[PDB]
Amino acid sequence: MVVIGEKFPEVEVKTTHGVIKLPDYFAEQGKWFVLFSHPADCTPVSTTEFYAMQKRVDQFRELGVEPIGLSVDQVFSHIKWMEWIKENLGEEITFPVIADDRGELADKLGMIPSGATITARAVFIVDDKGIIRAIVYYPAEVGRDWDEILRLVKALKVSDEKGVALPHKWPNNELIGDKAIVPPASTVDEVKQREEAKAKGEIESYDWWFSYKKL
Amino acid sequence: MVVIGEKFPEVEVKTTHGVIKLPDYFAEQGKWFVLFSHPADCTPVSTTEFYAMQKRVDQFRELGVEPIGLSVDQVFSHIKWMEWIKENLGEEITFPVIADDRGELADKLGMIPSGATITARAVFIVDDKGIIRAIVYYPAEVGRDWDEILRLVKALKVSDEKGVALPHKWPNNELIGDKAIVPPASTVDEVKQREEAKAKGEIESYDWWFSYKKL
Amino acid sequence: MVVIGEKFPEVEVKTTHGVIKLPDYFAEQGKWFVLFSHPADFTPVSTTEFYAMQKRVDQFRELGVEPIGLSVDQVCSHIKWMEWIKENLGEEITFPVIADDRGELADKLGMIPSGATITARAVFIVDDKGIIRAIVYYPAEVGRDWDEILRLVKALKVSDEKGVALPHKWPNNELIGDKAIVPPASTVDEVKQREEAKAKGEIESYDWWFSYKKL
Amino acid sequence: MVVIGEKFPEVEVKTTHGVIKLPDYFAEQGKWFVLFSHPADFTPVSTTEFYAMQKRVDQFRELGVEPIGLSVDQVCSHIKWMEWIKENLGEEITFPVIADDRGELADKLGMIPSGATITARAVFIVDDKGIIRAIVYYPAEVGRDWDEILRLVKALKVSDEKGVALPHKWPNNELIGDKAIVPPASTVDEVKQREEAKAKGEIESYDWWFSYKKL
Amino acid sequence: MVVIGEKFPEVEVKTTHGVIKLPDYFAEQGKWFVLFSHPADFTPVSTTEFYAMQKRVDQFRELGVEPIGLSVDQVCSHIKWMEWIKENLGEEITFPVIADDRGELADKLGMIPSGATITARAVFIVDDKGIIRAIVYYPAEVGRDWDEILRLVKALKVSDEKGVALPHKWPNNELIGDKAIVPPASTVDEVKQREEAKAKGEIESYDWWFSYKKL
Amino acid sequence: MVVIGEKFPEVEVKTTHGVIKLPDYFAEQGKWFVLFSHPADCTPVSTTEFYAMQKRVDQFRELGVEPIGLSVDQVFSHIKWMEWIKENLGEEITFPVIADDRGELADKLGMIPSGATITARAVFIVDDKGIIRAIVYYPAEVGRDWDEILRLVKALKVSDEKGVALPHKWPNNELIGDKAIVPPASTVDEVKQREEAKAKGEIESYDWWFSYKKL
Amino acid sequence: MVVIGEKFPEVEVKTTHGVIKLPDYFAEQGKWFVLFSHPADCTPVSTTEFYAMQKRVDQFRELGVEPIGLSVDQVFSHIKWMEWIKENLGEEITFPVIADDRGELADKLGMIPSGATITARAVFIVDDKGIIRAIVYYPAEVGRDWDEILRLVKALKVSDEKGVALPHKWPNNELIGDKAIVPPASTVDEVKQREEAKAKGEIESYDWWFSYKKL
Amino acid sequence: MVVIGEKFPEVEVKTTHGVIKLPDYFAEQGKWFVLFSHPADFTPVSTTEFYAMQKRVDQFRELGVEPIGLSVDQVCSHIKWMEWIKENLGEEITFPVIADDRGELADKLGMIPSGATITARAVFIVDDKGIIRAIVYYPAEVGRDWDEILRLVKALKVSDEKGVALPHKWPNNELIGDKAIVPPASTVDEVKQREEAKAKGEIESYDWWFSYKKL
Amino acid sequence: MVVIGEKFPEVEVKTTHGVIKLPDYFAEQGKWFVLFSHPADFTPVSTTEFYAMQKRVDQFRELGVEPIGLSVDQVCSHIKWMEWIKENLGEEITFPVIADDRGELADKLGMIPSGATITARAVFIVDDKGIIRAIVYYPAEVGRDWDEILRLVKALKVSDEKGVALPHKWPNNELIGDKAIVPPASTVDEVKQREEAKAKGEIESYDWWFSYKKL
Numbered sequence A, B, F, G: 001m002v003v004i005g006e007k008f009p010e011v012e013v014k015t016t017h018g019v020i021k022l023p024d025y026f027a028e029q030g031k032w033f034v035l036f037s038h039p040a041d042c043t044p045v046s047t048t049e050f051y052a053m054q055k056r057v058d059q060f061r062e063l064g065v066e067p068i069g070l071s072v073d074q075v076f077s078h079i080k081w082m083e084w085i086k087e088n089l090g091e092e093i094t095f096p097v098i099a100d101d102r103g104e105l106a107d108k109l110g111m112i113p114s115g116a117t118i119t120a121r122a123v124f125i126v127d128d129k130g131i132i133r134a135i136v137y138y139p140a141e142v143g144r145d146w147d148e149i150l151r152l153v154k155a156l157k158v159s160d161e162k163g164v165a166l167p168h169k170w171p172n173n174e175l176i177g178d179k180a181i182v183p184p185a186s187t188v189d190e191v192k193q194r195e196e197a198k199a200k201g202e203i204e205s206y207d208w209w210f211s212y213k214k215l
Numbered sequence C, D, E, H, I: 001m002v003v004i005g006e007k008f009p010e011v012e013v014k015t016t017h018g019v020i021k022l023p024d025y026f027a028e029q030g031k032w033f034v035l036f037s038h039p040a041d042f043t044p045v046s047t048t049e050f051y052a053m054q055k056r057v058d059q060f061r062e063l064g065v066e067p068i069g070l071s072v073d074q075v076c077s078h079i080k081w082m083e084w085i086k087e088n089l090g091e092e093i094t095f096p097v098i099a100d101d102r103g104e105l106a107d108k109l110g111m112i113p114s115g116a117t118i119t120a121r122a123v124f125i126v127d128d129k130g131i132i133r134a135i136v137y138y139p140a141e142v143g144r145d146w147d148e149i150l151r152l153v154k155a156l157k158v159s160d161e162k163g164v165a166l167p168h169k170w171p172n173n174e175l176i177g178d179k180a181i182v183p184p185a186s187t188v189d190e191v192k193q194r195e196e197a198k199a200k201g202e203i204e205s206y207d208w209w210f211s212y213k214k215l
């Protein structure tokens, strides 16, 4: 019961890093946060996701995006589980993990499938304004791909710094490559695009179909 | 607005290939469908993405999954855009594209962003039984990856046809590789199965809940 | 839904020249507007229409009448259509083009043919009081004639300011010529003037009702 | 939300010994169950309680009463917690533990304290007929005493077998010792019956209502 | 009907010590109170319980908690029953006994069994803030044990002033003995804090969550 | 809640002489019952009415009317209070006393003095048909007069064996005296039913005003 | 349906002394009223009742209570009937007699028996505060006793004036005599000072609850 | 409330001859009834009218009409009134007397004068069809004349049994005598027939409309 | 729709004596009026009645009451009818006759029979106050008797001047004769000659309530 572009509910949650409020603990220091949920149905796949997210927690943090886990568990079970991951899989877990009980956040963030209080492997990208910028709902049985979520958060970043729209499989589109397209003029072209085209920058056009930055 | 597991609503949707009873046009014939969705026809990102997904439509077709597009527009715009893609890109669109003007289904499926009348870049994987099986909600500025929607529907089909859960980034997991994950022992008697199955060597395991097999 | 002499509905809508409300945005600067709706962008007959009435827009502008296009598309590809016309036809486009979606305004002006969702070729003359003065509905397959809408607007301005009525084919009429028609004598006392003003050479007449003056 | 004597709510619970029907599963084999809710897994007080219940689970079972745990946790981390107990405290847990996520059963039993979402330390004695016979609600911070729940169960059993009432701190009451208390005479034939029984010395008494017999 | 941690309902009731507003009488005058409810006056089990409660009312009061009885009876015959106890059992009841007719409070406290009018054998520990700390509903047939209620009140105090949690059967726990339990490390930084304080000799542990200090 | 002539509510309720059903227990043997309910508050007055009712229960019984007390007490307190009567006022109470629960029978009869949750001093005379013959509601503070209730019952009997009406203060009226009043004739036929063989044998005529059965 | 203690329903009723509001005429005059009622005018038993009521109207009024009859008849019939009374019985009825057509007031007070449209023989003693202090409901077939109502009123004024409670058959109780009952002690301190007062001899008692004083 | 020709209300009325259905207890045996209403029994004028109605009750009965009295009184006091008349005046009243309680039928027939509560002196001649044939309303102060009601009833019977009209003071008319007036000729051919019959001796007449035949 | 005692409705009526407001046209002169309605002019029975009213209009007027006719006719037909009466029956008609337009006064006076639009033979006695004292409703077929209406008006006037009630058929009563009936009022001052004259023969009596004097 949330959509893209809606404010994250600014709620109080107990994590393995204190008790925080979400678009305060991250939005205040101008941080995005990738809030990824977990069912308690499948928790060997959750383990692989936690091993992978820590395996690539630098890439998220270099981007200025804070990973933050979530599940309907208690904190003590999570710290014990993450210590198991450190012991068996040789990997710390450095990001916080929310512990919502009775699934209040998942009810107010729409992560509860109907007929089962948890079946969704949900990911929310929330920007430094607190805007829910992208949602993913994998099934419990299929572990996600954090390379894809890395690509999505890189694309959300680039579209924010450079105001562009990011093609399919950017930056490995088969037609284009890594070139991000400037959103087409919703008014007369001259307002920005003719001023800023290859006459006055690297906002070069692509056969008059669009303007790309390659940036 | 909708969640996984929840039934796909019954709705009559007009498409470039006719008018269909959407949850049943594929279910009755035993097909899955990736109801994906773009903001507006002829947008360059949506064009790169229709191109890419029709270039992967074969791989969606070996898996019994039928692509279908959606947009809050008219079939006229869909067909005009499809024949632009036809002539100008060296490939033609071979999947129905819904005209959901009036936003009857996008509202229903939570597909429009907050404060908008246009649709986001959504994907709904719906299975042969008409059950919403997966969702993603990319924003308009970021285009999907269909390789990672192959991997999600490849993994969904494998989990349905073999009763296994699939790890992070399967079949490219860094702990396991392509080996699935068998359901964890959720019973003390079933736990005793996993220490003997590991000892028997039938499956590999880490801790009687994280058990994986080459299958 | 509308008829002649009815107030043009108060509507807020986006255009290639920005977002305006157009019962009275053109009436604020005391100008008339010829709202013409065409079926689809990048269709050749609509392109000939737009090119021709850009070719003759200085004649509409001189008359204090502001052309404004319309179709159920985006300002996206309205701008791109204008750019294509500029390139391949050597002609700018200098008038707003409403991107009324959902067929909202087109449903209030009743210019969606029954059994369709694409606009016909409608034209509405609206005067600087916000009142509809003429409607035409050409079918989608027949391009209009802007020379005739221009003749309409010249004649209808002349009637508006000089209190006259204009004949068929004015100012090229076979009987009268370019002379207008004075309001018919709808009273016995007025018949006295006409039967007498005809004998002073201010107006010519066929009878006391068919009285016309050179102006 | 439940009271003594009320029938235990008919529910499905996923224990660590499979999925069972509560009022029934223990009813068929002529068994009571002491259902005790603890707040969370890997909790210190809960771990002392689980260790102490295992140390005297046989005393509960030779009474015909089967301890069953409960928590807002998951069957994974119940076994993992019970495995921790096995090698750290040397006492392997042999009774089921309900993994009542979303607290729903807890919500029906009023085991969730005010404002919280985790459970308190509740105990429900339920007999063969699925009737709640006793309830305690300790706070999360105070560990229960299973010797008092044993004493309560022993007394609850004797009052059914032998139709008596049991004195305070039976079988170590100050006034009586281990003699039970016959139900008080509630009519004038029963008071004369009691005084005649006290005359024949079958029972002792302090008065006609407070009459007790060794049993 | 009420649960742990709830505010004791604000109500005035008449006792053998006068009419008192009870969540406020000994709340304002700075004391906890143990509200215990017996089914009827001149009941033998209730008589043994009142005898025992007066035997350990000194121990209750020296802890700052005041016993208060309750029954669906009159203040008349409450005093008559206490008088009977005084001559027959040779010790005088010093604590107030609420006489709530028609079971107003006894339904506000969910303290009458199902299919009954008489009250069960309930106990409510309430702190000086008016907060229900613990609840124990015993069946009419089983007399309570006030040594367990003393243990629970001692532990509730020690948990309030010393900010700890108390193990099962404290201060005679099997694993620990009389030593309290420090609240578990709910954060990974607190996990290091417990790990380091363990190598400071002031708490010892079997793990980072199960830590128990000396007092 | 009940009026004259209305059925006594068929209720089962527990007495000092065992659980009985009211309109039926006494109508079995076709004898009436006088149900007198006292408040549980003003014990001293009720003590004097129980003493008086016992002093004249022989006169009530030989009339075929069974006294039956009622109160919102417990049978233990009741039949310890009646023993107090026997011990301090020297007469055994020998009539049943309903110890009703919640005052349910008080609600069935509307004997509640307003504002309070207790009873007034009600008296219901119910005949061998379960019909309420008379109703008295004294206040809690004023004892009744059973002698008056004696002559009300004697009159209610004699009015049934003879079909008469009984004058004021019968049989000690100062005008009419002992003699009853045969109901005045309400049909011409009844007029000759009153003028039969010496006017029904031995009913006399006062002057001509009424006929009476003197004895 | 009105019980002891309820405010008398404020009604406007016609009487043989004009139209009068009931909880005003006597309340706003310092007087209580004994509102009695007979079934029908001119009936011999009701005539004896009216004769006796007029014979002791002086005793009633010197006591502060003034009688007011009532019937479901007309004021005209009361006037005629009282003329018969004055001529034949030689007593001029002085008190007002209500006449309520449709029996609305009699319906508010439950004065009409079931299976009847006429009134029974009711008596409502109401104090100057407007509160119903006593009710009796005799049937039509039994004439009332105004000596009993007079004793009740004498006894019920003394309760208001002297703040006591009056025993059975006061002032001719077979235990006490004419001495009233002081409020029972409802506190252990009150109990103590009750034995002190008995020792000092101001009151005399059978127990600490049954204390009486000679006035 | 009723007019001539209106069907007499169907009502059950308690007479002194038992309950009867009033319009048709006499319509069944083909008797008319003269319903006459007096203010009250034991009224001096009403007694003279009842005496006189008895003194000519045979003339009414031998003529097919049944007298029936009415008052707002009880059926007794009619019986007692006839007994006073039978002994003091020597006439035993043979006709029934209605006693409508609470003025039901009096309201229906409009015989309660304005500002009063008892009936006036009404007379309703009702024929064996249940049709009100005549109405008189004398005031309470003026006794009626039953000879006028006799000649009115004789005239009504003649006019029904001869189809004729009866003159003023028939059969003692000044102009005509005992001869009855034939219905006036309401048609020109009926006029001619009357003139023919006048010139036949079949009728006499002062005009075609004022024709009378001896009968 | 009117009853005895009401004020005669204030109306404007056109009579053969002019247009009057009749409730007060006669009231102002201090005169009663007997308003009588016949069905139609040139009706035979109506003609005998009009002849008879004129025969005794003197003894109506020497008594203070003015006859006034009424019918739903036109005044012109009224005078033509009086003229017919004068020439044929040889007598004037000196009282007014109302013509009401389609019966307004007749319909509000209930003079119109059921299922008809003409009047019946109604009579209304109206005193100088404008109060309806007596009503008769004869049918159209039965002529009235003005000697009885005289006796009624004599009796009404005697009752108003002498304050008595007139017996049946006064002054030709069978029992009393021509003597009136003195009121049963008490009037302590007045009732002394009611006793002495009772033995002086001035006031005779059949009983204490049935008393009559020569007047």
Ligand SMILES: *CC(=O)c1ccc2ccccc2c1
Residues within 6 Å of the ligand: A041, A042, A043, A044, A045, A140, A141, B159, B162, B163, B164, B165, B181, B182, B183, B184
């Ligand atoms: C959670 C998990 O490991 C697992 C494995 C296999 C499954 C098959 C079908 C449905 C759910 C499954 C979950």
Ligand SMILES: *CC(=O)c1ccc2ccccc2c1
Residues within 6 Å of the ligand: A043, A077, A078, A080, A081, A082, A084, B209, D074, D076, D077, D080
């Ligand atoms: C499977 C699961 O949920 C879980 C919870 C806690 C754990 C602690 C240590 C090792 C493994 C765990 C697994």
Ligand SMILES: *CC(=O)c1ccc2ccccc2c1
Residues within 6 Å of the ligand: B041, B042, B077, B080, B081, B083, B084, C041, C042, C076, C077
């Ligand atoms: C969908 C749209 O706006 C569009 C843009 C360009 C086109 C070119 C050729 C044919 C159809 C087109 C449609």
Ligand SMILES: *CC(=O)c1ccc2ccccc2c1
Residues within 6 Å of the ligand: A184, A208, A209, A210, B041, B042, B043, B044, C074, C075, C076, C077, C078, C080, C081
């Ligand atoms: C609507 C839009 O964004 C767009 C972009 C590029 C186009 C190229 C050719 C034709 C139409 C276009 C529309």
Ligand SMILES: *CC(=O)c1ccc2ccccc2c1
Residues within 6 Å of the ligand: E074, E076, E077, E080, F040, F043, F073, F077, F078, F080, F081, F084, G209
């Ligand atoms: C009020 C009540 O229930 C009561 C009153 C007097 C008593 C005397 C002795 C024993 C019990 C009593 C109870």
Ligand SMILES: *CC(=O)c1ccc2ccccc2c1
Residues within 6 Å of the ligand: F041, F042, F043, F044, F045, F140, F141, G159, G160, G163, G164, G165, G181, G182, G183, G184
């Ligand atoms: C019950 C009793 O003894 C008592 C005493 C005095 C009272 C005064 C006013 C109202 C009720 C009372 C009851």
Ligand SMILES: *CC(=O)c1ccc2ccccc2c1
Residues within 6 Å of the ligand: F184, F208, F209, F210, G041, G042, G043, G044, H074, H076, H077, H078, H080
């Ligand atoms: C029942 C009634 O109205 C009645 C009864 C006896 C009577 C005696 C004398 C006079 C009137 C009576 C009326």
Ligand SMILES: *CC(=O)c1ccc2ccccc2c1
Residues within 6 Å of the ligand: G041, G042, G077, G080, G081, G083, G084, H041, H042, H076, H077, I209
């Ligand atoms: C009501 C009734 O029966 C009644 C009323 C007045 C009377 C006066 C005199 C004689 C009898 C009467 C009866």
